[PDB]
């Protein structure tokens, strides 16, 4: 029941791509960063060339939460994206000196079920969770919003969506020290951003 898509048109429309960028920043700035770091940004967020493997599973309408303080529909739908995509950064290092450094995150890779909202020219990506979850495989997790105690307790357990992720960056010295303990912070940080920001409960929601 695989879902086609332009990706074309959606990794061109800059509606989208302004719309994740500022998701990312306005959700990575309630973080603590550390010391050795200041003025840290999404520069740039860029798709894959490459789409994700859509695979519709099911229609709903979209949550009554999805409503806020037909023509609407609710998409539930595997998502192999083994694709191209990367986020770009910007930061400072720091303390006799300070120095700016840039960044890609690349190999993106989750295979994972997610909502998807399209309501009040408005969409909704929540993801579920990674398809190989064992707490779906054991069933006790209800995946269904039809559908009573959907996500109920045991939500917490879920594996990590993101499966894999490259991080780079941009005299020697023991600076490099340093970069290290930034890509190893950045990961360790972003994974949590999609865990607590882009998982349900939560979402990203853009137009």
């Not at 429309?13 to 960028?21: A, E, F, M, T, Y």
């Not at 603590?32 to 859509?54: A, I, Q």
């Not at 609710?74 to 986020?87: A, H, R, T």
Request: proline share 4%; with cysteine; net charge negative.
């Amino acid at each position: 029941m695989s879902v086609e898509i332009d990706w074309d048109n959606i990794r061109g429309d800059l509606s989208v791509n302004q719309g994740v960028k500022d998701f990312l920043n306005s959700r990575l700035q309630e973080f603590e960063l550390p010391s050795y770091v200041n003025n840290l940004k999404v520069t740039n967020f860029d798709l894959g060339t490459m789409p994700p493997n859509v695979i519709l599973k099911q229609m709903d309408d979209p949550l009554d939460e999805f409503y806020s303080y037909n023509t609407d529909v609710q998409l539930l739908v595997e998502l192999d994206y083994k694709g191209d995509m990367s986020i770009e950064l910007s930061a400072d290092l720091v303390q006799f000196m300070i120095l700016p450094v840039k960044l890609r995150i690349s190999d993106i890779g989750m295979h994972c079920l997610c909502l998807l909202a399209y309501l009040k020219k408005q969409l909704f990506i929540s993801f579920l969770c990674d398809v190989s979850d064992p707490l779906l495989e054991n069933d006790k997790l209800q995946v269904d919003p039809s559908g009573p105690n959907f996500m109920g307790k045991r939500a917490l357990e879920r594996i990590s969506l993101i499966r894999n992720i490259k991080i780079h960056t941009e005299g020697e010295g023991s600076v490099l020290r340093s970069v290290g303990k930034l890509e190893e912070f950045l990961v360790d940080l972003f994974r949590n951003l999609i865990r607590k920001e882009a998982a349900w409960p939560s979402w990203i929601d853009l137009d």
